[PDB]
RNA sequence: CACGCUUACAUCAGUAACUAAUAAUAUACUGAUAAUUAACAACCAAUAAACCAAAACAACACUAAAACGUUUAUUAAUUACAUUGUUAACCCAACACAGGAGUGCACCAAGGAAAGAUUAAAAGAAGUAAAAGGAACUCGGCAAACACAAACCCCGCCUG
RNA sequence: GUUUAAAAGAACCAACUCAUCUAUGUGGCAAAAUAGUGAGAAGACUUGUAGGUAGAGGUGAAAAGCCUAACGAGCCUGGU
RNA sequence: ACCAAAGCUAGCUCAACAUACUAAACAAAUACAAAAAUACACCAAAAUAAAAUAAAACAUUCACCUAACAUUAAAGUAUAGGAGAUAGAAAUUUUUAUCCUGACGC
């Protein structure tokens, strides 16, 4: 399968 | 805040030891 | 500033028209007739408390319309800013 | 081709799909508004 | 009754006092000092 | 492991206040009083625990049976889920079997 | 009037009359170049051109000719310490062109006083003299000048 | 995404979204598409004559105040109708069926400014 | 106008909406709560303007006049008794005017003094038979008058001149109300002679 | 009469402009309807002038001379409005008996809450209005759970507030042993 | 201009630090004060009847049979000034992103700057030129080229 | 625009729409791009706005494609 | 020596009692594209719970699972169950009024 892991951003208060 | 007096008194002893090692009395 | 007249800026086709295309053989004007609309009546101006503008509206209509006409005639003859009118 | 720009803003579609009237015209949207009110949301709809 | 450890300072010092003459992070970090002190003994 | 740098104020606890002086005063009420009232009646607390003791599953079962009709929605849901989890864990999980 | 319910009009209804108006207007200086016959007001959001015309013609008896209104939007960009937007309130700005040819000019409501300026200059001179007399003597080198010998 | 906390005004929509800012209507739409303004719908400011009015926006600082006595319905009745009805009952011509002579109004729909429907803004 | 304060607020002898207070604690701070003894308004005997005595401090046993009171922390300050010296004029190359400011005092550290014997007494609230509530002492057994203090505005009703936009006392106290059963609208209409003949149509309300 | 928006030209550069006290409810009640109707505009002109002066002070980055005049004028106009409304309330209670001057009804919207729906002026009856007919004043059977949830949430809030007050009282009694 | 974002726009002042992926300072940070003014645009009649005969310079035709309208009769409150949109260097993509974006005008009369300062190592990317040979390279003439032509099969009729 | 008695699902080639091949890029300008080169380009054509079809389903000139960056069956909440 | 470290409070948790249970604000505007005063209507709808799990698989079955009868016993009894996993009563019995409520909870 074409398995892709999307990136996760961080909260902007940090 | 940690509820306790033993640690506080032991650290008072440690502080006195550090003070004696820093400024040795005559 | 002219915006306090009030005048508003716009962008569309800027044309120089005398009333007919340049290929028309009658490229000169004789007399214009301008009927004032119902918004600029004497009664409406008196209600608006604008009595001294009863002549200002006529003067403005004339100064605008006749200048547009004569400028269209001059630019149809071939005169412009750098080729200023001779007659 | 390039993704990520799937949101094309338009106030008509916004208010017609997630508006107050759209939520209140159906019993499920009324339940949505009630759930948002129970949670205490500052904004119940668009 | 929440019970937390209050003498962890001395629990760590009793092990770090045997590593002060070491080289590298074994004389500072506790995770690396417990292993270096056991091998020392 | 940073321990506080100042001594805390010594709590002056008096072991001779009203509660500490009259604690457990009527524990022998039935024995020394021509038994009419069991020491159960001195237990102050929740209704489903006055003179009763059990494990967590029995506690939850008794609470739901006694005061379940007055609990809130989320509280009753959490109680039902705790009952289910304790049932499954105590009847299917463990080592000694 | 604002924040009040108006009677529904129908054919043959009486004339709507307001006895105690709830509108309060400010007279603001034009931020841009304005002609002589134009006055700039800040009016409530619920006030119309005819409402301001009647306001100026009845309460203050001003021969107005034209009224033009606009709605200025207040900024909602600044953030609080909680990162919450603080919105400046929107306001209605009206431009009133006078009728009889009267020329209005916003006056200088804060003219400076010559005596006040002279007093401020004297205070500045006294402060400078005090600083000069309190400045340390360079020939002493930090020795306190209070003790005599 | 768009913003939800900001107010939904007429400045934030398309050309076909023109929401008023709170002003009252002053007329209707005529025949040729223009707006016909009704002179009965525009508020007429009733301004009195302040020429010989000897009263200022502020009062004397040395002038004394009074104890708070909020005017009540019973006090108003005692001030306007109790003496008249008392005199009428002492004279013996009191009529319980007709109370219009003392100021009572049976139906509000007759007069111009009614109280319960509140036909007047201010 | 009234300013709003967070529940975790500290009173520091400054106005809650003053620049000094805004510099002391900006709107992002929430300090620890100080325990304040509960004293209702019916049990506060310490007012502004009376001669009180100090109990503890370096200047103990001395008497002074109350200048300000703070009910949120049970604080009172007297003028020039319990003082510390602070500089106000401060610049890059000049200082001066070291003024003695006053530190606040607690109701446990200050008690009211009777004007009769000039001795510290305890104050108790009593109800006299004439319908007044006057503070009565218990040590000697006398009453304490009310220390009338001038208001913070700085204007005295004894010496006051009416300006161009002020009404006289006669015009302010002139009673001209005729309590009849007409509204202000009908009164003004009948006064100005406005004649309205047509009446409203049927309006539905729902 | 466009100068009425400004004070006297001899009070323009003044630092402090003193004025009298504000109107109090008793002084307003002592006057008649004519004098109240006139004092309304007398105060309105002063309020407009003070607002103009405040905006001009903001523009010039200078403090407004004695800004308490605006507070006094607003307080006086509020007292006048309160007195006129009190007279209107007494008159309407004497004539009709209604407490409120606008018709309304205690309704129950679709959200289960109990609201006070005020009435609007319509030229047609209620059974012929499209915009009014598509409104619902009643709750469906799925709103009872949300009503009970609101009840329980408010009960929990009140309970924890009462517990907080009790704990604060106990802490204060333990900190101050003056008993 | 439309759609969209809402003041990020304008004036003055400051930038030690915060935003600009660095400075200078400032349309992008901070504070105060001001602003977008209707003629353009939005909201801006129903009820019956006469009405088959396309738009494409529309003369007249083709097939795929084609949006866009007047007149007549009955009622349409009638009386200046109603309300709302008017800034921007901007929108959607985590960003001051080499990407995605409808329409009418012109190809400059309007917009901007590829290089922070040096040296001219290797390797890498882009380009130009090259003796003699001209596919001998390579899976394949891929790529490139002063060439930019002619044929033979397999599979799909073809456009899509 | 050019060739055509042609607006011929004709031809050359712009705007425009796709994405054949190669080289860079591969935490990059970019969670699919840049440069060169390509295919269509009056039509079964591109495209603006607004509405509809909703997951035991919709839609599909069947790639088991697409249905808000992971679809042999979306995501969120609850069962948990 | 920097970076840093330590406070004791804000408040929460579990119960008891309890009036008897959708707080306060509701001037105007708010189910037109919510907070937009103002025109001849249409308004409303119900049809079982399922499955994840256990039966070491999975097909009949699988306590609780947002429906009041509480407590002491009968009793985990009679019974119901691929008679397996498990489920599970009743007849009949006991239950004395109020304060003494706070916390070996953070
Ligand atoms: Mg996204
Ligand atoms: Mg406008
Ligand atoms: Mg959002
Ligand atoms: Mg709009
Ligand atoms: Mg727009
Ligand atoms: Mg008009
Ligand atoms: Mg944005
Ligand atoms: Mg920088
Ligand atoms: Mg700025
Ligand atoms: Mg513009
Ligand atoms: Mg270079
Ligand atoms: Mg450059
Ligand atoms: Mg460079
Ligand atoms: Mg090289
Ligand atoms: Mg090369
Ligand atoms: Mg070459
Ligand atoms: Mg060669
Ligand atoms: Mg070969
Ligand atoms: Mg080879
Ligand atoms: Mg090739
Ligand atoms: Mg070739
Ligand atoms: Mg070739
Ligand atoms: Mg093919
Ligand atoms: Mg063929
Ligand atoms: Mg072709
Ligand atoms: Mg390409
Ligand atoms: Mg090349
Ligand atoms: Mg190309
Ligand atoms: Mg081609
Ligand atoms: Mg081809
Ligand atoms: Mg749709
Ligand atoms: Mg299946
Ligand atoms: Mg399917
Ligand atoms: Mg296939
Ligand atoms: Mg396949
Ligand atoms: Mg997805
Ligand atoms: Mg199984
Ligand atoms: Mg298993
Ligand atoms: Mg299996
Ligand atoms: Mg299985
Ligand atoms: Mg089940
Ligand atoms: Mg059987
Ligand atoms: Mg088996």
Domains of chain D: 1-46 (1.10.287.3980)
Beta bridge partners of I135: I125, I144
Place of tokens 């005092």: I105
Beta bridge partners of I77: I68
Q: What are the angstrom distances between the C-alpha of I56 and each of D45, E10, I60?
A: 62, 44, 5
Nucleotides of K under 7 A from a protein CB: 1-9, 30-45, 76-86, 91-94, 99-100, 104
* Residues found in chain B: 26
8 A C-beta contact, residue I142 and residue I136: yes
Any domain includes I57: yes
What's the Å distance between residue A11 CA and nucleotide L71 C1'?
28
Beta bridge partners of I100: I85
Please give the backbone phi and psi of residue B16, each rounded to the nearest 5 degrees, phi first.
-65, -40
Q: What are the angstrom distances between the C-alpha of F44 and each of F5, F49, J162?
A: 41, 9, 21
Residue J165 Cα to ligand 17 midpoint, Å, equals 98
Q: State whether residue D7 sits within 8 Å of chain H by CB.
A: yes
8 A C-beta contact, residue I112 and residue I46: yes
Beta bridge partners of I95: I90
G61 vs G50: CA distance, rounded Å: 15
Q: Which of residues 1-26 of B touch F (CB under 8 A)?
A: 2, 5, 7-12, 15
8 A C-beta contact, residue I86 and residue I98: yes
J170 vs I18: CA distance, rounded Å: 34
Contacts of G94 (CB under 8 A, 6+ apart): G40, G41, G42, G43, G47, G49, G52, G67, G68, G69, G70
I116 vs I118: CA distance, rounded Å: 6
Exposure of E38 in the CB half-sphere (CA atoms within 13 A):
6
Any domain includes I65: yes
What would the two tokens of residue A1 be?
């399968």
Q: What are the angstrom distances between the C-alpha of D29 and each of D18, D43, H1?
A: 9, 14, 21
Any domain includes I160: no
DSSP I7: S
What's the Å distance between residue H29 CA and nucleotide K52 C1'?
38
Tell me the three state secondary structure of residue G22: coil
CA dihedral of residues H64, H69, H75, H79 (deg, nearest 10):
10
B10 vs G136: CA distance, rounded Å: 53
G43 vs G41: CA distance, rounded Å: 6
DSSP H helix total and E strand total for chain E: 2, 0
Ordered domains of chain G (ranges, CATH): 1-149 (3.30.70.330)
F49 vs F66: CA distance, rounded Å: 10
User: Which DSSP string do the residues of J10-76 spell out, in sequence order?
Assistant: GGSS-S-----BPP-HHHHHHS-HHHHHHHHHHHHHHHHHHHHHHHHHHHHT---SSTHHHHHHHHH
Q: Is the peptide bond before J108 cis (omega within 30 degrees of 0)?
A: no
Any domain includes I172: no
Q: What are the angstrom distances between the C-alpha of J49 and each of F74, G91, G95, G108?
A: 59, 18, 18, 15
What would the two tokens of residue G33 be?
């170049």
B7 vs J153: CA distance, rounded Å: 42
Query: What does DSSP say about strands H44-45 and G17-18: parallel, antiparallel, or unpaired?
Result: parallel
Residue D29 Cα to ligand 33 midpoint, Å, equals 27
Any domain includes I164: no
The structural domain count of chain I equals: 1
Considering only residues 1-20 of chain D, list those whose CB is below 7 Å from strand L.
1-4, 6-8, 10, 12-13, 16-17
DSSP H helix total and E strand total for chain A: 0, 0
CB-strand contact H72/K, under 7 Å: no
Where would I find the beta strands (DSSP E) of A1-14? none
Nearest CA to I166 out of B16, J73, D36 is that of: J73
Phi-psi label, residue D20: left if phi above 0, alpha if psi -120 to 50, beta otherwise: alpha
- Structural domain harbouring I92: 3-148
Q: What is the structure's resolution, reported in angstroms to one decimal?
A: 3.0
Count the Cβ atoms, other than its own, within 10 Å of residue I137.
20
CB-strand contact J25/M, under 7 Å: no
* Sign for the pseudo-dihedral over CA of G33, G38, G44, G47: negative
Nearest CA to E34 out of E9, E4, E5, E13 is that of: E13
Q: What are the angstrom distances between the C-alpha of D45 and each of D28, D34, G87, H6, H21?
A: 14, 11, 20, 12, 21
Any domain includes I33: yes
C33 vs C65: CA distance, rounded Å: 10
CB-strand contact F40/L, under 7 Å: no
DSSP H helix total and E strand total for chain G: 2, 5
Nearest CA to H118 out of J91, F46, C77 is that of: J91
- With both helix axes pointing from N to C terminus, report the angle between J33-60 and I184-192 in degrees, rounded to the nearest 10: 100
E8 vs B2: CA distance, rounded Å: 12
8 A C-beta contact, residue J73 and residue J81: no
H55/J91 CB distance under 8 A: no
Nearest CA to G100 out of C48, H65, H43, F61 is that of: C48
Tell me the three state secondary structure of residue I133: strand
Any domain includes I140: yes
Nearest CA to G27 out of G6, G48, G42 is that of: G42
* Residues found in chain I: 206
If 0-12 CB within 10 Å is exposed, 13-18 middle and 19+ buried, where does residue H54 land?
A: exposed
8 A C-beta contact, residue J96 and residue H115: yes
Query: What does DSSP say about strands J121-122 and G26-28: parallel, antiparallel, or unpaired?
Result: unpaired
* Residues found in chain E: 41
Q: What are the angstrom distances between the C-alpha of F86 and each of F46, F58, F59, F83?
A: 21, 9, 11, 5
Tell me the three state secondary structure of residue I189: helix
Contacts of C45 (CB under 8 A, 6+ apart): C51, C53, C54, C57
What would the two tokens of residue G144 be?
């306190």
Distance from CA of residue J29 to its chain's centroid?
20
Distance from CA of residue D26 to its chain's centroid?
13
Tell me the three state secondary structure of residue I136: strand
Q: What are the angstrom distances between the C-alpha of E21 and each of E28, E33, E35, E36, F59?
A: 10, 11, 15, 11, 57
Exposure of C6 in the CB half-sphere (CA atoms within 13 A):
10
Beta bridge partners of J105: J117
8 A C-beta contact, residue I104 and residue I13: yes
Phi-psi label, residue C85: left if phi above 0, alpha if psi -120 to 50, beta otherwise: beta
Beta bridge partners of I96: I89
J95/I181 CB distance under 8 A: yes
Any domain includes I168: no
Contacts of J78 (CB under 8 A, 6+ apart): none
Helix or strand (DSSP H, E) at I85: strand I83-90
Q: Which chains reach chain E with 3 or more Cβ–Cβ distances below 8 angstroms?
A: B, F
8 A C-beta contact, residue I110 and residue I55: yes
Q: State whether residue F2 sits within 8 Å of chain B by CB.
A: no
User: Which DSSP string do the residues of H39-102 spell out, in sequence order?
Assistant: TTTS-EE-----SS----SBB-TTS---------HHHHHHHHTHHHHHHHHHHT---SS--GGG
J172 vs F20: CA distance, rounded Å: 22
């Amino acid at each position: 399968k074409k398995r892709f892991t999307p990136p996760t951003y961080q909260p902007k208060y940090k | 805040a940690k509820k306790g007096f033993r640690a506080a008194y032991r650290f008072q002893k440690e502080l006195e030891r550090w003070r004696l090692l820093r400024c040795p009395p005559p | 500033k002219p915006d306090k007249l009030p005048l508003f800026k716009r962008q569309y086709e800027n044309t120089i028209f005398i009333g007919s295309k340049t290929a028309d053989p009658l490229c000169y004007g004789h007399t214009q007739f301008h009927l004032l609309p119902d918004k600029l009546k004497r009664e409406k101006l008196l209600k608006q408390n604008c009595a001294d503008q009863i002549e200002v509206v006529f003067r403005a209509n004339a100064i605008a319309s006749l200048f547009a006409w004569t400028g269209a005639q001059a630019m149809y003859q071939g005169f412009w800013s750098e080729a200023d009118v001779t007659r | 081709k390039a993704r990520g720009n799937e949101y094309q803003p338009s106030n008509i579609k916004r208010k017609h799909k997630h508006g107050w009237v759209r939520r209140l015209r159906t019993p499920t949207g009324v339940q949505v508004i009630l759930r948002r009110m129970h949670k205490g949301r500052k904004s119940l709809s668009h | 009754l929440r019970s937390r450890v209050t003498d962890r300072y001395w629990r760590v010092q009793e092990v770090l006092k045997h590593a002060r003459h070491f080289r590298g992070r074994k004389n500072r970090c506790y995770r690396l000092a417990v292993r270096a002190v056991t091998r020392a003994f | 492991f940073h321990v506080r740098v100042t001594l805390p104020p010594r709590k002056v606890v008096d072991r001779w206040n009203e509660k500490r002086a009259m604690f457990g005063v009527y524990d022998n009420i039935g024995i020394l009083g021509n038994f009419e009232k069991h020491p159960k009646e001195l237990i102050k607390g929740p209704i489903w625990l006055r003179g009763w003791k059990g494990n967590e599953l029995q506690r939850c079962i008794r609470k739901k049976r006694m005061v379940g009709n007055r609990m809130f929605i989320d509280d009753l849901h959490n109680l039902n889920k705790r009952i289910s989890y304790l049932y499954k864990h105590f009847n299917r999980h463990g080592k000694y079997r | 009037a604002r924040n009040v319910l108006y009677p529904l009009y129908q054919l043959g209804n009486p004339q709507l009359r307001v006895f105690r108006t709830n509108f309060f207007i400010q007279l603001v200086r034009p931020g841009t170049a304005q002609p002589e016959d134009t006055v700039q007001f800040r009016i409530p959001m619920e006030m119309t051109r005819v409402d301001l015309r009647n306001y100026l013609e009845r309460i203050y008896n001003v021969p107005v000719a034209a009224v033009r209104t606009r709605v200025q939007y207040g900024s909602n960009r600044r953030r609080d310490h909680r990162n919450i937007r603080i919105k400046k309130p929107d306001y209605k700005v009206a431009y009133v062109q006078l009728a009889l040819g009267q020329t209005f000019t916003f006056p200088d409501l804060f003219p400076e006083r010559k005596g006040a300026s002279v007093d401020v200059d004297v205070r500045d001179q006294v402060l400078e003299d005090q600083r000069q007399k309190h400045s340390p003597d360079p020939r002493r080198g930090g020795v306190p000048g209070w003790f005599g010998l | 995404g768009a913003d939800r906390m900001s107010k939904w005004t007429s400045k934030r929509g398309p050309r076909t979204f023109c929401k008023g800012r709170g002003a009252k209507g002053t007329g209707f739409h005529g025949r040729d598409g223009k707006f016909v303004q009704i002179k009965e719908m525009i508020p007429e400011l009733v301004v009195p004559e302040l020429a010989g009015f000897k009263l200022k926006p502020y009062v004397n600082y040395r002038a004394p105040e009074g104890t708070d006595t909020p005017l009540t319905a019973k006090q108003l009745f005692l001030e306007t109708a109790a003496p008249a009805i008392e005199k009428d009952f002492k004279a013996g011509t009191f009529d319980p069926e007709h109370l219009e002579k003392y100021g009572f109004e049976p139906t509000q729909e007759g007069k111009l400014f009614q109280l319960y429907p509140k036909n007047f803004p201010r | 106008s009234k300013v709003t304060l967070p529940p975790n607020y500290r009173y520091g002898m400054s106005r809650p909406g003053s620049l000094s207070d805004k510099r002391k604690n900006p709107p992002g701070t929430r300090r620890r709560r100080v325990p304040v003894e509960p004293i209702s308004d019916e049990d506060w005997h310490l007012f502004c303007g009376d001669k009180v005595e100090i109990l503890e401090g370096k200047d103990a046993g001395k008497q002074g006049k109350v200048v300000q009171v703070i009910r949120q922390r049970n604080w009172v300050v007297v003028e020039g008794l319990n003082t510390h010296y602070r500089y106000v004029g401060k610049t890059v190359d000049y200082r001066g005017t070291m003024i003695p400011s006053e530190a606040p005092l607690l109701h446990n550290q200050v008690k009211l003094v009777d004007p009769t014997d000039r001795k510290p007494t305890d104050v108790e609230w009593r109800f006299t038979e004439a319908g007044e509530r006057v503070r009565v002492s218990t040590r000697s057994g006398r009453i304490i008058p009310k220390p009338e203090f001038p208001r913070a505005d700085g204007i005295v009703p004894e010496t006051w001149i009416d300006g161009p936009k002020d009404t006289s006392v006669e015009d302010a106290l002139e009673k001209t109300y005729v309590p009849r059963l007409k509204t202000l609208e009908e009164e003004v209409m009948e006064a100005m002679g406005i004649q309205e003949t047509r009446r409203h149509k049927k309006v539905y309300w729902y | 009469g466009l100068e009425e928006f400004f004070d006297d030209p001899k009070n323009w550069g003044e630092e402090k402009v003193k004025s009298g006290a504000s109107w109090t409810c008793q002084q307003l009640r002592n006057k008649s309807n004519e004098d109240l109707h006139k004092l309304w505009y007398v105060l309105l002109k002063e309020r407009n002038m003070l607002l103009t002066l405040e905006q001009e002070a903001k523009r010039q980055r200078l403090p407004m001379p004695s800004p308490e005049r605006l507070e006094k004028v607003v307080d006086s106009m509020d007292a006048l409005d309160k007195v006129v409304q009190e007279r209107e309330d007494a008159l309407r209670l004497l004539q009709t008996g209604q407490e409120k001057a606008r018709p309304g009804a205690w309704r129950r919207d679709i959200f289960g809450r109990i609201i006070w729906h005020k009435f609007k002026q319509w030229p047609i009856p209620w059974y012929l209005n499209k915009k009014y007919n598509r409104k619902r004043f009643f709750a469906m059977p799925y709103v009872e759970r949300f009503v009970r949830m609101r009840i329980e949430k408010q009960a929990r809030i009140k309970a924890r507030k009462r517990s907080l007050e009790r704990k604060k009282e106990k802490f204060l009694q333990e900190k101050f042993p003056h008993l």
